[PDB]
Ligand binder design. Structure first.
Ligand SMILES: *[C@@H]1O[C@H](CO)[C@@H](O[C@@H]2O[C@H](CO)[C@@H](O[C@@H]3O[C@H](CO)[C@@H](O)[C@H](O)[C@@H]3O)[C@H](O)[C@H]2NC(C)=O)[C@H](O)[C@H]1NC(C)=O
Ligand SMILES: *[C@@H]1O[C@H](CO)[C@@H](O[C@@H]2O[C@H](CO)[C@@H](O[C@@H]3O[C@H](CO)[C@@H](O)[C@H](O)[C@@H]3O)[C@H](O)[C@H]2NC(C)=O)[C@H](O)[C@H]1NC(C)=O
Ligand SMILES: *[C@@H]1O[C@H](CO)[C@@H](O[C@@H]2O[C@H](CO)[C@@H](O)[C@H](O)[C@H]2NC(C)=O)[C@H](O)[C@H]1NC(C)=O
Ligand code: NAG
Ligand code: NAG
Ligand code: NAG
Ligand code: NAG
Ligand code: NAG
Ligand code: CL
Ligand code: CU
Ligand code: CU
Ligand code: CU
Ligand code: CU
Length: 559
């Protein structure tokens, strides 16, 4: 807990810890543990926030979202996940949390663990809060998170700008009436549907019936407010703005950034932004608009105007009067203008394109189903009953092709990755690429052009090497792979483990769009504790015993 974090000095936290401290290598010892219990239940004919009854949902503790985890920088968070679903297994992934030397607690089923069996199966996740900011959690059992197994994480720590009130979490998500397994099945042979609605902090109004409620945020006149915006969607990529107000970015994902004032912000699936809103305008109700750019290349909604109300305290009630001007089209791309407070520097002149640093993404339509996404010639398909960690604990190096293992043996060195977005394919779509266990550096991408143009770019050293940035580029866990283009990333090999690198669009990862970075295998085995190993084997023995009794088959990648 803090000793010097005041509304005038958010930069200070405690003795020897501040905004300037390198959080990746230095963590405060608090000795405090914040514990929670996640009871997953399967509810049929559930009444949703917009009035429409959902066929089936999978909730945590009976609510639309799980409890918002709150702890301080340096604490340990512990969660006992109890699976009371009927047929489905589960695994909770702590998106944003690096799991430094705790790979076995990542929640990546078929990689770091076997799924927790239903009908009462349990497992206790435990991890250290070595990072401060806004993150989230979700299931990784195929597209199970689309049914409601989602929630937020707020690890308190210092900030890059002073503020008065911390308004907390603001998760924006797409909402479908059809269940996730039905949607994965539809997307296997058809183009993805637009969302039925878009929920903002758990609620939205039905554009047809008028039922529901708009999310209502009360701003205090003349005060600076911190808002933690999240995109917890399965496909929808958002654009956000507040009429007559600007937003000052103080963090991108779980990485603190220097103040950057904007009119609107693009949020890819899995992306987060901590912003400061100054209630500097006239007392009235203002609309917080959720819009779409990229000409529907990265999503859409059947609700033409998803919005929230930002009410000034003292002002009258009702709905806002000003509709405002439409925001600029972000073209399905996140901003590369954000510069981290704690800097990093890497050489970019030395990069050479080789098969071992290149990851070509492609859409294979030559099989059954039609929509099969491949990375380097293979669609990922993990084995829930024999995860990558089982191979490590037995000394087996015969990993099947389908696991998409990319073994990185480099010890604490910066590794380079060029991701290619099907430049020779019939068409290309933008993809929100996410990396487990690390924060990557966004070194550069193909020139920003309209997301629906179909303009293709292949990495040319003669012009693209000068377009790269190695002098403190954006550091985060999720960024956009441009349509028909390319993306150059770099991460330091400081965390031995099996880490997934995938597109966060549920339908795509289901279709196989992922690779598994097996980082320093030899170091990983030696760093696995007897408690972690014993428990992993307990859960795998229980899952392998349950599987033959399951009346349903695995229809996708399992991720
Ligand atoms: C996890 O639990 C869910 C919910 O029970 C399971 O989803 C259900 O899966 C079945 C079989 O895939 C679906 O029925 C099938 O639907 C297809 C498409 O319409 C149809 O062609 C088949 O004849 C069959 O009727 C069912 O609709 C679906 N339910 C929901 C709400 O999505 C899922 O299979 C379980 N996952 C695992 C691996 O255990
Ligand atoms: C931000 O969100 C608000 C609230 O959802 C948007 O306000 C809505 O604006 C639309 C027009 O763009 C209004 O609907 C339209 O009404 C006309 C009436 O003649 C009709 O012909 C159209 O077919 C359409 O239905 C709507 O009444 C209004 N919502 C309310 C209740 O105030 C606003 O446009 C959004 N602003 C931006 C820049 O995204
Ligand atoms: C993508 O697959 C290709 C082919 O399977 C890999 O290319 C081979 O890489 C090894 C290791 O460097 C070389 O010894 C071979 O000569 C390469 N074969 C080719 C295509 O000439 C490539 O490494 C894979 N990419 C990644 C990053 O996994
Ligand atoms: C938080 C606040 O400003 N209080 C208002 C109150 O004055 C008003 O009577 C009511 C209905 O509009 O909405 C609330
Ligand atoms: C989970 O919740 C259900 C319904 O609320 C209840 O029946 C069950 O006992 C709970 N399981 C545990 C162990 O909390
Ligand atoms: C989000 O909704 C919750 C309702 O559970 C509310 O307590 C919270 O204040 C809302 N967030 C803000 C500050 O808008
Ligand atoms: C929003 O909440 C505030 C605080 O209670 C209130 O003043 C206002 O009337 C509410 N607006 C709506 C549309 O409910
Ligand atoms: C290694 O793992 C494979 C699974 O891909 C299994 O078929 C094989 O029997 C194992 N061999 C060893 C080393 O025991
Ligand atoms: Cl992560
Ligand atoms: Cu995630
Ligand atoms: Cu993740
Ligand atoms: Cu994708
Ligand atoms: Cu993942």
């Amino acid at each position: 807990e803090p000793t010097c974090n005041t509304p005038s000095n958010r930069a200070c936290w405690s003795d020897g810890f501040d905004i300037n401290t390198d959080y990746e290598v230095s963590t405060p010892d608090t000795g405090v543990t914040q514990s929670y219990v996640f009871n997953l239940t399967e509810v049929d004919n559930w009444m949703g926030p917009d009035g429409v009854v959902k066929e089936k949902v999978m909730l945590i503790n009976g609510n639309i979202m799980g409890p918002n985890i709150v702890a301080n920088w340096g604490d340990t968070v512990e969660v006992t996940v109890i699976n009371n679903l009927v047929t489905n297994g589960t695994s909770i992934h702590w998106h944003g949390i690096h799991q430094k030397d705790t790979n076995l607690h990542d929640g990546a089923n078929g990689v770091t663990e076997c799924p927790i069996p239903p009908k009462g199966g349990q497992r206790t996740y435990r991890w250290r809060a070595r990072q401060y900011g806004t993150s989230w959690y979700h299931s990784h059992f195929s597209a199970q998170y689309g049914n409601g197994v989602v929630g937020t994480i707020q690890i308190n720590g210092p900030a890059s700008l002073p503020y008065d009130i911390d308004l907390g979490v603001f998760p924006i998500t797409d909402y479908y009436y059809r269940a996730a397994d039905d949607l994965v099945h539809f997307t296997q042979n058809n183009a993805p549907p637009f969302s039925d609605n878009v929920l903002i902090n758990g609620t939205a109004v039905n554009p047809n019936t008028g039922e529901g409620q708009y999310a209502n945020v009360t701003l205090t006149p003349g005060k600076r407010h911190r808002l933690r915006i999240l995109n917890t969607s399965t496909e929808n990529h958002f654009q956000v703005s507040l009429v007559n107000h600007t937003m000052t970015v103080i963090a991108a994902d779980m990485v603190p950034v220097n103040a950057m004032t904007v009119d609107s912000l693009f949020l890819a699936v899995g992306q987060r932004y901590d912003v400061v809103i100054d209630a500097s305008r006239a007392p009235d109700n203002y609309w917080f608009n959720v819009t779409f750019g990229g000409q529907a290349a990265c999503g859409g909604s059947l609700n033409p105007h998803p919005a929230a109300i930002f009410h000034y305290a003292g002002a009258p009630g009702g709905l806002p009067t000003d509709e405002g001007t439409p925001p600029v089209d972000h073209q399905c791309l996140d901003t590369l203008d954000v510069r981290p407070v704690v800097p990093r520097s890497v050489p970019v002149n030395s990069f050479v394109k080789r098969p071992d640093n290149t990851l070509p993404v492609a859409l294979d339509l030559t099989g059954t189903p039609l929509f099969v996404w491949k990375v380097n010639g293979s669609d990922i398909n993990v084995d829930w009953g024999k995860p990558i960690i089982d191979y490590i604990l037995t000394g087996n190096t015969s990993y099947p092709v389908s696991d998409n293992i990319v073994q990185v043996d480099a010890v604490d060195q910066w590794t380079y990755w060029l991701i290619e977005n099907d430049p020779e394919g019939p068409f290309s779509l933008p993809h929100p690429m996410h990396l487990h266990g690390h924060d990557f550096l966004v070194l550069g991408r193909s020139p920003d052009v309209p997301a629906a143009s179909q303009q293709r770019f292949v990495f040319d050293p003669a012009v693209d090497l000068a377009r790269l940035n190695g002098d403190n580029p954006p550091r985060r866990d999720t960024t956009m792979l441009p349509a028909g283009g390319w993306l150059l990333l770099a991460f330091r090999t400081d965390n031995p483990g099996a880490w997934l690198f995938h597109c966060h669009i549920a339908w795509h990862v289901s279709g196989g769009l992922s690779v598994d970075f097996l980082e320093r295998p030899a170091d990983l085995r030696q760093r696995i504790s007897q408690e972690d190993e014993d428990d992993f084997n307990r859960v795998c023995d229980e899952w392998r015993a349950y599987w033959p009794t399951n009346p349903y088959p695995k229809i996708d990648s399992g991720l």
